[PDB]
């Protein structure tokens, strides 16, 4: 039966032994492939379960009605038959995992206390213990198998129904926030988890109740205190979890703000370095980091108070019960005490899994509510009426429709067209053509009139849908491939030029791409698809919205007039050009019919259409270096030693408390003789000993000591790990990524913004948690083995082969698990891609007929994703069962060891060995899983560490005054692999002289500005300012003088005062004087807080002119002797332009002025004009002389610019 699951018997299904061959193949080969994973096993396909659920829901709706219908009843009825069997198996395992400690151990200890010699009794008891262990383990395996299969079935069915519903929506208004995910995406994983890890809820209370009753039976009124301890304990941990969640949410808000600021200042680095403004941003980031650190610290304390639930509770309950029981006058023995302790050690198993069940159930309930909210919407309704006459295609007779908002836009619409007729519709903006287009497709609701439609539609929207596939099939849209049709379509739409542009051929994709395409080409492929589809009636809505006249004419005369001569065409557009050739024109205005007839008749009528026409014509290897780096960053070996010492001290304290309990009992009476009864005798009772308060005092002291040590350990570990994480990344990374050069160009800025947002989370939140859990588990295992082997020295024989077996099995398990995970991870993505591409643009999908193709593709991709999930879960259960077998063997060995030696060991030590052997169950799986999880988190540190690893000449400040600018053959190159931009450039500028820069783009205009600031080192020559070489002056000293106004005005978040002067080097009087000169003082004065008013990002509070005026203000604040102006007139109005020229000439008239712009009039008034071409200086003369020379290129450019106005 194909899949092996359907052929296995009961024994193979109970042990998961049908998966064994895959492990052997994975070991032999090295990696797996999708060719031999498996297929799907039937009984889990989408169609069968979808039909079943649909039938159930329809029956429910018919039975009750759409007011009180519930999805919970339907889901329960769907999953009713198997949950009962799962519950029965769980009850059997919980009942059989308690009969061991309560009945088997007590009889064994009581036998040890007796004075006989038998082997049959002890052998029978050993047999009983082993059999109970086996039964418990195998029952648990069966429960898990059943639950996994049921969950997979339910998830598939619900997801397929959810995506089936969406394709028939006629009120699409919710954004792609619910539809894309919460209905057909990972939202079904919650419904899977509710049946996989949900349920299992009646597992804790039952065993807890049974244990409480048994304890009261054994001891009684003094045995009635363990219940009190447990009840008073657990709600405290609930409260601690709530507080941790609250603090975590607040920290999330703060770090979101920090990363927002980091993104804001990551790409302005030229602006920052041009003024040497690196001080402020460091301060701001440091403050935000401090606040985040404090909140994280508090959350860490409250989260770490929790991880020690079980042994602490056991010790507390035992101490209280036994102390109160003894300090009243009573009797105790080894059997009772150690039976009670062993029972206390088995109550705390299902209380390790109840909370996950509760939270999973809550999430599932919310998801079901959302699904039921979706399932009630308006369906589709397609018109099936046929025209009375065969010559009629569309029919309209006094039909009125209202758009559902119900808003009327159409009123008494009547028209009639026939096959082979071209009809054009004209109207203004908002006339109501779109309402008619929406009504003819049947989307609009019907209120009055009759509708008749025959034919097939071909719809071209004003926007291209663009489908994630190859060009050939995208044009094909699921049609048979041909040759003459294909080339006729290409020639008709003149797509051949575009084919040569494509790198490879017409086989690439039109998805995200790297070059995208133009709107006109998208329109061209849209009409290509439409006219290749070969439908009956064509609906064309303004396909030529943004095209040139020529291509419109060729497209028209090639396709519309020839191909669709006999095909009905409906044309809706605003332009009145092609309407000459149309055989019918209908004018729509104010939702009523105005004109009807041919074009010539329309001109004959001479109505509003004539007026409008006239107006228009007018891998994960992770070597040890990572661990070494983390340890070195944490502080050194001393921190490691301190933390390990504290862990060992805590666990040793717990072990000492239990040992003292064992040591008190052995000292029976103390060779004390009493005269009770009628004759003297030596008592054997523990109460008779005169010294009893000693031992109770030492008990209380032990409890207090253990509590104090646990608190100290938690605090110290949290603080140390937080310091280790906070130093490395931020301190040694932000200080380095603020002084590279050119590194910012040949590297995307979207992958340096990352590693500041995700890696910080991975290093701050999860690593300490996982490390703490792992270390605690390992140390506990070591202590348990040592404590057992201390009493019986021969126990260190059955530990060797078990270690060898564990080492053999672990590697195979790890390889199989990794390989199975990778396949699911790789195969996830096309599912999501198809879902997104289908959700975007439902109109065209519903336009022709296509629903079945998309549904089939969805189902196929669903199954291909589903299979490896099931395989992965089965592998995990396989490993768990093997480890359980090892533990059972160890327990049986120690029990037999106790039995075989009798009469030479006191009963108390035998009880202690038994009490410590039971604790070993269910630890190895936890240890292995936690080791893998904490290994997977040590990858971020590697990337961060990799990215981290990869004079004098101070003269007097006489720079001002005679500020001469001289160039002597300056050469520079942007990169070492590119041609030199500047080639022997030399010029001298006199002080207080105005110079303009003109030339074509790419000829080296920006090179002068880049090299004047020494941002890129020159390759030859030298530049001297005021007789001082710029190479001998420090970068900080040189940049503090010159100023440049950028072509685009940018502003940062904060107050106006910070945006004007962050260094607080100026008082208010100069700021007001500067603001008054640019006539913006009144605007700031009108602000309620003036200079304290808050400024949003990008300066959205102000208009463009205000931003530019603020830029000139901050330029005027510095009072520089040398100024560079760079294209201040990009898209700014003429009034503001004359304003800025007036302000510049009134303010910058006492300093050297250099201008680089595309407007000749800006540099017309300059003393001299510079012309550059191909990196060489061409012309250097006054404007009067340059204009007088015809051969000058500047004069030719001026004539060409002037001809654009005089001629036109």
Residue numbers in the entry: 97 to 501, 574 to 786, 838 to 1169, 1179 to 1436
Quoted passage from the original study:
Human multidrug resistance protein 5 (hMRP5) effluxes anticancer and antivirus drugs, driving multidrug resistance. To uncover the mechanism of hMRP5, we determine six distinct cryo-EM structures, revealing an autoinhibitory N-terminal peptide that must dissociate to permit subsequent substrate recruitment. Human MRP5 was demonstrated to play a critical function in regulating cellular cyclic GMP (cGMP) homeostasis, which is essential for many physiological processes, including the maintenance of vascular smooth muscle tone and cardiac contractility. hMRP5 also influences signaling transduction pathways and may contribute to drug resistance in anticancer and antivirus therapy. From a clinical oncology perspective, hMRP5 can directly contribute to cancer drug resistance through the efflux of many anticancer drugs, such as methotrexate, cisplatin, purine analogs, pyrimidine analogs, doxorubicin, and antifolates from cells.
Since the R motif does not contribute to the EM density in the central cavity of hMRP5, we generated a further truncation mutant hMRP5-Δ1-94 by removing the flexible region from Met1-Thr94. This deletion did not have an significantly impact on the ATPase activity and overall inward-open conformation of hMRP5, suggesting hMRP5-Δ1-94 retains dynamic conformational changes to enable substrate transport despite lacking the N-terminus. However, the peptide-derived density was lost in the corresponding position of hMRP5-Δ1-94. This indicates the central cavity density arose from the Met1-Thr94 flexible region, revealing an auto-blocking mechanism where hMRP5 is inhibited by its own N-terminal fragment. Collectively, removal of the autoinhibitory peptide does not disrupt the ATPase activity or conformational cycling of hMRP5; thereby, the empty conformatin of hMRP5-Δ1-94 likely represents a critical apo state primed for substrate recruitment. We found that the helix backbones remained unchanged during the transition from the peptide-autoinhibited state to the apo form. However, the side chain orientations of several residues differed, including Tyr244 (TM2), Glu289 (TM3), Phe452 (TM6), Phe988 (TM9), Lys1040 (TM10), and Arg1148 (TM12). In the apo form, the Phe452 side chain reoriented toward Phe988 (Phe452-Phe988 distance ~8.4 Å). In the apo form, Lys1040 rearranged towards the cytosolic side. Meanwhile, Arg1148 moved from the cytosolic side to the pocket center, likely due to the loss of the electrostatic interaction from phosphorylated Ser60.
